[PDB]
Amino acid sequence: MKVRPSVKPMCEKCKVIRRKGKVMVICENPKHKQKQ
Amino acid sequence: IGKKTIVIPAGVTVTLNGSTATVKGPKGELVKEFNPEITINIEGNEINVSRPTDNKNHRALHGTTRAILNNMVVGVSEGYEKKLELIGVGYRAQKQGDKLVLNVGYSHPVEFVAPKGVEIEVPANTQVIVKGYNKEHVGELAANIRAVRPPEPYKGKGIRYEGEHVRRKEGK
Amino acid sequence: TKGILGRKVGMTQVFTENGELIPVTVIEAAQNVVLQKKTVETDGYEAVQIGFEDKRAKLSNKPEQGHVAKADTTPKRFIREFRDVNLDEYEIGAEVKVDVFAEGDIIDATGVSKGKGFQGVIKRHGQSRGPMAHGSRYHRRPGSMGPVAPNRVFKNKLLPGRMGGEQITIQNLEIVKVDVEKNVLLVKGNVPGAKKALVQIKTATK
Amino acid sequence: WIARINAAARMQDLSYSKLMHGLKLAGIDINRKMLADLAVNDIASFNTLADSAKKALA
Amino acid sequence: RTTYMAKPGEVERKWYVIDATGVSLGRLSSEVASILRGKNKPQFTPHIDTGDFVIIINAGKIGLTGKKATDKIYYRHSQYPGGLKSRTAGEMRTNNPEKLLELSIKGMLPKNSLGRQLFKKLHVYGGSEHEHAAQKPEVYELR
RNA sequence: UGGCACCUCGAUGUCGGCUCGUCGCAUCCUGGGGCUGUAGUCGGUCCCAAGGGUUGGGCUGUUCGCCCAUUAAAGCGGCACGCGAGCUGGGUUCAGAACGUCGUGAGACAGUUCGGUCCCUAUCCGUCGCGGGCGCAGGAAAUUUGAGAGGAGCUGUCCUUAG
RNA sequence: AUAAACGCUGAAAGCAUCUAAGCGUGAAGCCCCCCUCAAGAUGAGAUUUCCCAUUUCUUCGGAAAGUAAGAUCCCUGAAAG
Ligand SMILES: [Mg+2]
Ligand SMILES: [Mg+2]
Ligand SMILES: [Mg+2]
Ligand SMILES: [Mg+2]
Ligand SMILES: [Mg+2]
Ligand SMILES: [Mg+2]
Ligand SMILES: [Mg+2]
Ligand SMILES: [Mg+2]
Ligand SMILES: [Mg+2]
Ligand SMILES: [Mg+2]
Ligand SMILES: [Mg+2]
Ligand SMILES: [Mg+2]
Ligand SMILES: [Mg+2]
Ligand SMILES: [Mg+2]
Ligand SMILES: [Mg+2]
Ligand SMILES: [Mg+2]
Ligand SMILES: [Mg+2]
Ligand SMILES: [Mg+2]
Ligand SMILES: [Mg+2]
Ligand SMILES: [Mg+2]
Ligand SMILES: [Mg+2]
Ligand SMILES: [Mg+2]
Ligand SMILES: [Mg+2]
Ligand SMILES: [Mg+2]
Ligand SMILES: [Mg+2]
Ligand SMILES: [Mg+2]
Ligand SMILES: [Mg+2]
Ligand SMILES: [Mg+2]
Ligand SMILES: [Mg+2]
Ligand SMILES: [Mg+2]
Ligand SMILES: [Mg+2]
Ligand SMILES: [Mg+2]
Ligand SMILES: [Mg+2]
Ligand SMILES: [Zn+2]
């Protein structure tokens, strides 16, 4: 998990969602997990 | 787009009481509540639902109501099951009547008891199945069984479903 | 759960069958009777009331004499209550014997400590002295009372005062030997209080 | 006086604001002291004045 | 000159029972505080007590809009260093509804000896049963 | 480290150590997790977490720093650089004397060196203990519920599971 | 009961998705459990037992003046100070 103020997609299969009112991306590559 | 046209196959007893609901089939009894703000329709063999408000806070509820009515109808008719297989040396499974045992490389056996409405049967020491008539309980019990020893990417040893692409590495 | 009341007789040692030598404290528990029974329909909680020693009718007064006469006995000197106990036993006026315990049970001891008078902060709270040479003029004093900013001194600033005499319970404390005929109870270790104190013995909570 | 008049006029289904507006609009020029006196110990006359104020508003 | 000032015991003080099912906490407390103060009578004298007695039932169903049931905190300090304690509003509604209502109403009364006398006229029950049937209270409807 | 010169020159005592602590979290240890260029043992990085814990000496007045031997660890900061009507007085910062240097000189030097008076019976609040009075709609003797508050809260090594 | 986190079912957005309605796990931390104080908690609580309804005056309100249960003055002391 990467905790950044600058969450954004990192490849062509990343996906951006919202959980409990905060932006995060999820990918099948675990290196791409991000959350604000 | 499209979230309508529920069809009752056969032998399914569905009734509506206030904001509640009640479904009976050949398997078991399922009862649960719904918000009054949604609209439910009943006749001999078809179910329909409509959203009067038609906004964000109501379309999702319309969809989920349709989905879980479909789930309750199909569960008592056809049933639900999940597939778990154990990979690696020394991983077995035995059934002590209505009780499940697992040897997953720990210094103490781990015990699982199937709650009401679900049945755990073990065809072979290296493969198990869970049965039931609602998706939620069966899925959650299978998830709890797998969570004891989830798969690991280096060799693949662990408990896993039959249809996931677990990632693999080298680890020289 | 069981319980009796007794007096601290003394302090001694015995040899076990294994061979080792252990210290024990002797407790005499004669003449204690069940006085009153408290119920949840009448009081809000369940308890038993026990009285320990007979005392002369010269020393007792009419209220307590009627209270003890309600259970057909003579006035008692110590009266206490036990909770977490089963009310099915303990008929009113029945006596409690030391044989309610057996060799090997784990108990709790409750009593009032020995009294130390107005004691300083080094005996009372275990502080540290200041240097006693190298020109120092600070030996057995409390310390700094705090910073400057609050314009005051906080609470729990430990200071001299009356030291001992509080209720103390020490727990998980094994029993060694029971003598029914002499009404004594040999229990391994220390218990709070001076000699002739009241000791309240009861089954370990944990 | 204002608090007392407000309390007495809320029992006629009227605020202090509406009652004062109606009294000004009807032409009555009684100060708050006399109105508070009437509210305390001549409640019938106070109700009469409140009725007149209601008439003026509509 | 001539302005009416009430005297102790000169004004009748009645009893009311108020059902608190579904009403917001502050919106109920404001009305109750006005009733206790005595501001609904044309006999209102600021320096004495002319208000009524209030009984509140069903305090366990009081309403809390928004996320107040979890995000509103009640703080205490024991005046010992580091002795601050917290408690959320939903927990108190579940466990001590009476104390929740009492804190809410007490914050809205004057902060003097008369306010301390007025606070003693409020009885709050978490259920629907009260023990003051001897006073023959009436039903009060909000607004 | 500075800038300003707003309170204090009819006096707001200064560095280090001792006694006594309390608070913040930007967490040193212990607890729970995500990613790994994570085979295991050991690590790196980030996330939640302030409950407890966080060593004894050699040199220097020293803070700091280096070193010795340990430890699960030897956290960073605030409180008048916390704490002198609680202590010390080694340093700085009084009168004596000497060195190097500057000055014609009397003398001077964030250069050095040896020696150099640390006053006070606690009124009010505050803190720690202990009593008298009245109240609690009659006067007494015991046994108690518990709103509320304080305390405690740490952690190693060995054996087995198992080479 | 939760924090970070991991999930089940599930639409908005025919798919996907731990969240939007609804469920389950989850920390030396929070609230309990453990030890002590605690009804001046003026919101002054509860139980068991004991004494009883005297005499003078009062404009009622009320006052004094001998007592009951009980306690103390005074005296011998320590396990307390
Ligand atoms: Mg970037
Ligand atoms: Mg020392
Ligand atoms: Mg000395
Ligand atoms: Mg202050
Ligand atoms: Mg500065
Ligand atoms: Mg200027
Ligand atoms: Mg100055
Ligand atoms: Mg001055
Ligand atoms: Mg943090
Ligand atoms: Mg950690
Ligand atoms: Mg860790
Ligand atoms: Mg700490
Ligand atoms: Mg040496
Ligand atoms: Mg510090
Ligand atoms: Mg100072
Ligand atoms: Mg300082
Ligand atoms: Mg100093
Ligand atoms: Mg000082
Ligand atoms: Mg010196
Ligand atoms: Mg000189
Ligand atoms: Mg020269
Ligand atoms: Mg000398
Ligand atoms: Mg010297
Ligand atoms: Mg010197
Ligand atoms: Mg002094
Ligand atoms: Mg007292
Ligand atoms: Mg409590
Ligand atoms: Mg208090
Ligand atoms: Mg502590
Ligand atoms: Mg749980
Ligand atoms: Mg725990
Ligand atoms: Mg009482
Ligand atoms: Mg003797
Ligand atoms: Zn990606």
Experimentally determined by: cryo-EM
Residue C52, judged by CB atoms within 10 A of its CB (0-12, 13-18, 19+), counts as: buried
Q: Do D6 and D15 contact (CB within 8 A), yes or no?
A: yes
Residue holding tokens 């076990």? C16
Closest CA to C100 of C186, C3, C5, C171: C3
E73 CA to chain D: closest CA distance, Å? 35
Which helix (H) or strand (E) segment holds residue C162: the answer is strand C161-162
3-state SS, one letter per residue, for E19-48: ECCCCEHHHHHHHHHHHHHCCCCCCCCCCC
In sequence order, which ranges of chain B are alpha helices (DSSP H)?
A: 56-77, 135-146
CA–CA separation, B74 and B62 (whole Å): 18
Q: Which residues of C touch E82 (CB under 8 A)?
A: none
Distance between Cα E24 and ligand 27 center (Å):
29
Q: For strand G, which nucleotides have at least one atom less than 7 Å from a protein CB?
A: 4-14, 16-25, 31, 34-37, 43, 46-51, 69-71, 79-81
Helix axes D2-9, D32-41, angle to 10 degrees: 50
On chain E, the residues whose CB falls within 8 A of the CB of D5 are 42
What is the count of residue pairs from D and E with beta carbons less than 8 Å apart? 26
Residue in C10, C11, C182 with CA at minimum distance from that of residue C97: C182
* Per-residue tokens: C132: 């006693």
Listed as ranges, the nucleotides of chain F within 7 A of a protein C-beta are 18-24, 33-39, 46-47, 51, 79-80, 82-83, 86-89, 125-130, 140-146, 148-151, 161-162
Residue D33 and residue E3: Cβ atoms within 8 Å?
yes
**H or E element at residue E56:** strand E53-57
Q: Is E98 left (phi over 0), alpha (psi -120 to 50) or beta?
A: alpha
Ligand having the closest approach to the CA of A3: 1
Tell me the C-alpha distance between E1 and B26, whole Å: 90
- From chain D, the residues in CB contact with E39 under 8 A are 3, 7
Q: Which residues of C132-156 are buried (b: 16+ CB within 10 A; e: fewer)?
A: eeeeeeeeeeeeeeeeeeeeeeeee
Protein-nucleic contacts, chain E 53-92 to strand G, CB < 7 Å: 85
CA-to-CA separations, E56 to B94, C198, E88, in angstroms, rounded: 60, 50, 22
Nearest Cα of chain C lies from the Cα of E64 at a distance, in angstroms, of: 34
Which nucleotide has the shortest C1'-to-CA distance from A31?
A: F35
Q: What are phi and psi of B101, to 5 degrees?
A: -120, 150
Q: How far apart are the first and last CA of chain A?
A: 10
Give the nucleotide nearest to C51 (CA→C1'). Answer: F143
Token pair for E126: 């978490």
Q: State the DSSP H helix or E strand holding residue D27, giving kind and residue range, or none if neither.
A: none
Chains C and E touch (3+ CB pairs under 8 A): yes
Chain E residues whose CB is inside 8 A of the D39 CB are 42
**Residue C44 CB lies within 7 Å of the nucleic strand G:** yes
CA distance to B91, B99, B161, C51, per residue, from B106 (Å):
10, 19, 21, 56
A5 annotated as a binding-site residue:
no
| Contacts of residue E61, Cβ cutoff 8 Å, sequence gap at least 6 | E20, E21, E22
Q: Where are the beta strands (DSSP E) in chain B?
A: 6-7, 13-15, 20-24, 29-33, 39-42, 46-50, 80-87, 92-95, 99-103, 110-113, 118-124, 127-132, 158-160
Q: Token pair of B120, please?
A: 């755990």
Task: Answer yes or no: are the C-beta atoms of E124 and E97 closer than 8 Å.
Answer: yes
Q: Which ligand gives the minimal distance to the CA of E82? A: 29
Neighbours of B132 (CB within 10 A): 25
Strand G contact residues in chain B (106-135), C-beta within 7 Å:
135
Q: Best mutation site among C145, C154, C157, C158 for testing chain E: the one with the most E CBs within 10 Å?
A: C154
Q: How far is E111 from chain C (nearest CA, A)?
A: 27
What is d(CA D16, CA D18) in angstroms, rounded to the nearest whole number? 6
Is strand G less than 7 A from the beta carbon of B2? yes
- Contact residues, chain D, for E3 at CB < 8 Å: 1, 33, 36-37
Q: List the single residue in D7, D33, D36 with the smallest CB-CB distance to E41.
A: D7
- CA nearest E28: which of E104, E128, E91, E92? E104
Structure-block tokens of residue C9: 């007789």
- Annotated binding-site residue? C134: no
